[PDB]
Design a protein around this ligand. Sequence first.
Ligand SMILES: *[C@@H]1O[C@H](CO)[C@@H](O)[C@H](O)[C@H]1NC(C)=O
Ligand SMILES: [Ca+2]
Lengths: 49, 49
Amino acid sequence: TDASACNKCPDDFWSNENHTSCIAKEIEFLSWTEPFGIALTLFAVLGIF
Amino acid sequence: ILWSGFSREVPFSNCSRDCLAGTRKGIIEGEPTCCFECVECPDGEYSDE
Ligand SMILES: *[C@@H]1O[C@H](CO)[C@@H](O)[C@H](O)[C@H]1NC(C)=O
Ligand SMILES: [Ca+2]
């Protein structure tokens, strides 16, 4: 509290909505365990069969 | 007026230099209002004065 100015959050992280503590930037890719990824791999496996 | 007895320009006697148009004044803890910083405006915000 009573902070004169907002300090820069580290590069890999990003501030939340309340700008209290900054968390890491959400990684993002087509995960194997993701429902879309699992559906696509199931379709590919069924087609190979 | 000869300012220091020889010069002809009004001396600068402000605590901090005037902030530019793109910047805004930021406080310094323990210092009076005449002393401030020049924090840049965030994205999406502007300052003309
Ligand atoms: C503001 O949002 C953040 C999100 O991490 C969290 O601290 C809390 O839910 C909210 N309140 C405060 C005081 O931070
Ligand atoms: Ca003081």
